Design a protein around this ligand. Sequence first.
Ligand SMILES: *SCCNC(=O)c1cc2c(C(F)(F)F)nn(C)c2s1
Ligand SMILES: *SCCNC(=O)c1cc2c(C(F)(F)F)nn(C)c2s1
Lengths: 88, 88, 147, 147
Amino acid sequence: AIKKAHIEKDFIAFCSSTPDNVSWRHPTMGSVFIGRLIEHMQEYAASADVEEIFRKVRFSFEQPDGRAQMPTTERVTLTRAFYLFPGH
Amino acid sequence: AIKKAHIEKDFIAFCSSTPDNVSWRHPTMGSVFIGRLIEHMQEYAASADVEEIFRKVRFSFEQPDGRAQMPTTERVTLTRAFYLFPGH
Amino acid sequence: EIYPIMDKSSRTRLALIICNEEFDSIPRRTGAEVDITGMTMLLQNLGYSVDVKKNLTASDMTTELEAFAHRPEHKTSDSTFLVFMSHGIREGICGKKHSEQVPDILQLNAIFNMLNTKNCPSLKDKPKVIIIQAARGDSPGVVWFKD
Amino acid sequence: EIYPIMDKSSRTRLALIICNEEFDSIPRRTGAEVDITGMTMLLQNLGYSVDVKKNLTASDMTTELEAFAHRPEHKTSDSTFLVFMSHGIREGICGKKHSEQVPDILQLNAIFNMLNTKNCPSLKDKPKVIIIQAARGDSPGVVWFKD
Ligand SMILES: *SCCNC(=O)c1cc2c(C(F)(F)F)nn(C)c2s1
Ligand SMILES: *SCCNC(=O)c1cc2c(C(F)(F)F)nn(C)c2s1
């Protein structure tokens, strides 16, 4: 049996195009991009899909005050909505 | 008065990476990518946001039968959800 | 958490469609007129004033997009639509005078740098939808599998 | 219209984190250990088995990603996560032996061509999340405006 299948499908890239250079004060400090991502991944995992979670990360970075960050979601090839389902 | 503002913000690109060459039969036929986009833009305009509409276009192209198409949403920089609101 | 829409009574929504069908060396894009008619009618029903441009070079596409960003209509608008319809390669959108020996390509990065906050302050905090149609030189994106 | 999740009792979720902090010429990425600890703990709580790789060249990143695609764990999995953490330029992710004179870049297009259906049939119809961290050589993405 044979069936057609897309070569590139079910992809989602979430990358920060904005620079994230190391600070002079607190050199061992964690990344603001990585940190904010995890914070949203913990609270909104059992309520929203990953594509919608990335939007919440973008919405939180709407007003610049500390590090200027604005990540872009690229090559979205997800046909459906991907819910993580914590503990399932 | 002065305020900080992101250089690249509130963007959404919806482009077809898959080839859309002209057919030998019916040379003046409209594009399947453009056609399917409009069909979803007409029915789901007063119910879903554009980013979610593009997903419905991707979901409709999940199984290849005619022209093999799978568009990718790129450089998503939308902080909020953009609803079109027809006739408002 | 939704983008604020502008009142219909006093708004100036503006959209741009750049389509290339007639070329100098690369194959003709026949049936593109149906794509233009379809998109223009759609966007106009959504409230956007549509500007249609036919058969332009990469240099002409840069100037037309730069002129579109500095339009006073965007000041009293809430959103915009950009439609590109032509041949596509690894870099981006092909122009009308594009050939194998002499390249004429409008880069995708230049489009985003044109409607960005720095070069286009009128569309700040406003959704910018860029629909591109680019037929690439790679075999139909389908692979068979045994099941 | 939701991606079908696999039962927790009999699933083998797998994730890969490739981080670069120590370099030969380009500046050190100090504080990256916090990013590794944070992401590994997160993904493991989500059910993913995390493989962590430290300080690799573009050639080493290609082989490691190719080996990750052919893992038998993906056959009994429902999703995957890929995390890249290094310096970034116009092309993509920088390697450990990357310099101004001698370039060592892992292209972003190669990552998608590695986990695609043709080269990775095990992750067909399964969500593939690729989180990249790339600090680019362009002044902080902020512009002032008069209001
Ligand atoms: S992870 C962020 C890196 N981004 C890219 O690799 C590029 C994305 C694009 C586009 C887009 F399609 F988004 F418009 N155009 N170019 C030239 C690039 S590079
Ligand atoms: S409109 C489709 C054209 N796409 C692009 O211009 C490119 C997007 C990317 C990426 C991505 F960030 F998505 F991974 N990486 N490269 C090298 C490109 S080109």
